[PDB]
Design a protein around this ligand. Structure first.
Ligand code: CA
Length: 579
DNA sequence: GCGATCAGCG
DNA sequence: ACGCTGATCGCA
């Protein structure tokens, strides 16, 4: 039902200077994944190519790599990384429909062309699920069915760039798409393809040591509980704790007894099995997720893991990291922080460099709320987390333990993002009246932040959405809900999303300026990871000096706020030593 | 498949 | 009854 050429060879009319392009990687994880078909829609017609044909043709490769030949795509990063695994560069992507859809409404969860087309009442294209099937029935269909479905996706991309750019313009998001998200998409492709090298010997050794520490812990648990049970099964774990040992019930999930770590820490005075269980889970978490899980996804030839950065998933504009998640590698506990010793540079004589913004969401909040005292605090380069530990625990700066600090870190974010006195009290083991009066005092020092939280909720109510400093947008329909719980979660979304998503935009612009900087300095240094407010690079040791002077300035200068941005930086032989 | 849990980022 | 994630595991 759609006219197109099944091309046997590459012709000149498939090489126009503007085109919609589809490079299908059906595999979920597109690293080293097969390319199953290629479709080109342009002013001369609709063409389907087999990858063996086109990806071996010198003119087609030349056309993919030519930045002056513009391509419109859905999920250009997926295509670009699959082609990198094939020795082929893709440039000139001028429109990425996936990222256009994402800016317009991140809650749609657009994950194929058909879902984004629907936003503009375009339906001449099928959902990928309907073509490839789900689960274990997943299959590339036959060439005639595959070819039409790629051509329909391409035709759809072709027809929708203009209506999508039009809405982006009205929303003030067009420069956000073309100058921020699409450039960032090429950078993330380089980072994902480059990978991070992993010391598998060291990781293997930790795994053998974790196995023997686990049993030993697991044994004391069995002799304290009397019997044995699936310590991971809250069924009999509940029966052990809140029935056999008769410990108080402090929380009930919808399932039953809550055995979460906040509860267990509160039961620590009652019995010496709750601490062992906690130590057991920690050791379990390290062994399943970061020892075993990491070794599974290591590419054996190179000992590099290749994350996938989701750019169009989170509701606030942050990235997300998947298979493996390299954005929640342990750091706070010593046993788990040792895992970062396994993450090493990909080349002898190279080092890891890591820079990060100091309390960036609070600096943003100070800029957006225009709160005098909060702006002054950061113009003094105060550490508000330590200064809050001092007020909480009534000590001096020298006496602030890192524990008291991370606790005040949660009070600072918790208070500004709507924590209740109940919630503040559960986290400080103080009375609920003390927690309420601390929150009153805290908004005495920062009335401008209080005004800001009231106003942003009135602005959500009026407009239907909240925006970020760079005009990322998030619809909050529940902000006017009649249900008190549903309305309150939406109010705290209105207080949080403009801040957290403004910090995501800032580090996104920083990454873009960093790459351009590294290119004019022509350094071999390159990004490896982004962990929300931290940029981790690797580089030859000969380049660290330059990087110490370039990376902080580039980050601090990404945007200009009414308070300065602060950046800490370290380097070392491993990611461990880079903090 | 989903809820609980927990690792990280703020 | 602060917010944003992803992986693992058990299953009331
Ligand atoms: Ca930080």
């Amino acid at each position: 039902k759609m006219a197109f050429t099944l091309a046997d060879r590459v012709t000149e009319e498939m090489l126009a200077d503007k085109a919609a392009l589809v490079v299908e990687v059906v595999e979920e994880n597109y690293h080293d994944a097969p390319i199953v078909g290629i479709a080109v829609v342009n002013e001369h017609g609709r063409f389907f190519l087999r990858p063996e044909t086109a990806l071996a043709d010198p003119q087609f490769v030349a056309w993919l790599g030519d930045e002056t030949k513009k391509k419109s795509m859905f999920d250009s990063k997926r295509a670009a990384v699959a082609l990198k695994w094939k020795g082929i560069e893709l440039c000139g992507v001028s429109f990425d429909l996936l990222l256009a859809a994402y800016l317009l409404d991140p809650a749609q969860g657009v994950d194929d062309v058909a879902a984004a087309a629907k936003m503009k009442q375009y339906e001449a294209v099928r959902p990928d699920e309907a073509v490839y099937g789900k689960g274990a029935k997943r299959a590339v269909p036959d060439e005639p069915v595959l070819a039409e479905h790629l051509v329909r996706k391409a035709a759809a991309i072709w027809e929708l760039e203009r209506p999508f750019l039009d809405e982006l313009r009205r929303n003030e998001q067009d420069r956000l798409l073309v100058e921020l998200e699409q450039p960032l998409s090429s950078i993330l492709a380089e980072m994902e393809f480059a990978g991070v090298k992993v010391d598998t010997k060291r990781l293997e050794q930790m795994g053998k040591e974790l196995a023997e520490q686990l049993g030993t812990v697991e044994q004391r648990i069995y002799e304290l509980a009397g019997q044995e049970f699936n310590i991971n099964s809250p069924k009999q774990l509940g029966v052990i704790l809140f029935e056999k040992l008769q410990l108080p019930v402090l929380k009930k999930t919808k399932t039953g007894y809550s055995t979460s770590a906040d509860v267990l820490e509160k039961l620590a005075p009652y019995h010496e099995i709750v601490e062992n269980i906690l130590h057991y889970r920690q050791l379990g978490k390290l062994q399943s997720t970061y020892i075993e899980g990491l070794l599974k996804v290591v590419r054996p030839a190179t000992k590099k893991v290749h994350t996938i950065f989701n750019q169009a998933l989170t509701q606030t504009g942050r990235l997300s990291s998947t298979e493996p998640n390299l954005q929640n590698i342990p750091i706070r506990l010593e046993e788990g922080r040792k895992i970062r010793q396994a993450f090493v540079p990909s080349e002898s004589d190279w080092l890891i460099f890591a820079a990060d913004y100091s309390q960036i969401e609070l600096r943003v909040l100070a800029h957006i709320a225009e709160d005098d005292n909060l702006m002054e605090a950061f113009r003094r380069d105060l550490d508000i987390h330590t200064k809050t530990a001092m007020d909480i625990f009534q000590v001096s700066e020298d006496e602030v333990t890192p524990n008291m600090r991370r606790q005040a870190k949660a009070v600072n974010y918790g208070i500004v993002y709507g924590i209740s006195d109940y919630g503040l009290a559960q986290n400080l083991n103080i009375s609920r009246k003390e927690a309420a009066e601390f929150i009153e005092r805290y908004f005495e020092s920062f009335p401008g932040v209080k005004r800001y939280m009231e106003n942003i909720v009135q602005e959500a109510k009026q407009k239907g959405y909240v925006t970020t400093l760079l005009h990322r947008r998030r619809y909050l329909p529940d902000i006017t809900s009649r249900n008190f719980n549903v309305r309150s979660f939406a109010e705290r979304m209105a207080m949080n999303t403009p801040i957290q998503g403004s910090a995501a935009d800032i580090i996104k612009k920083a990454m873009i300026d960093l790459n351009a900087r590294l290119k004019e300095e022509r350094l071999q240094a390159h990004l490896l990871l982004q962990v929300h407010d931290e940029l981790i690079l690797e580089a030859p040791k000969e380049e660290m000096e330059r990087l110490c002077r370039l990376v902080p300035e580039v980050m601090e200068q990404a945007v200009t706020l009414r308070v300065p941005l602060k950046v800490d930086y370290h380097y070392g032989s491993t990611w461990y030593d880079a903090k």
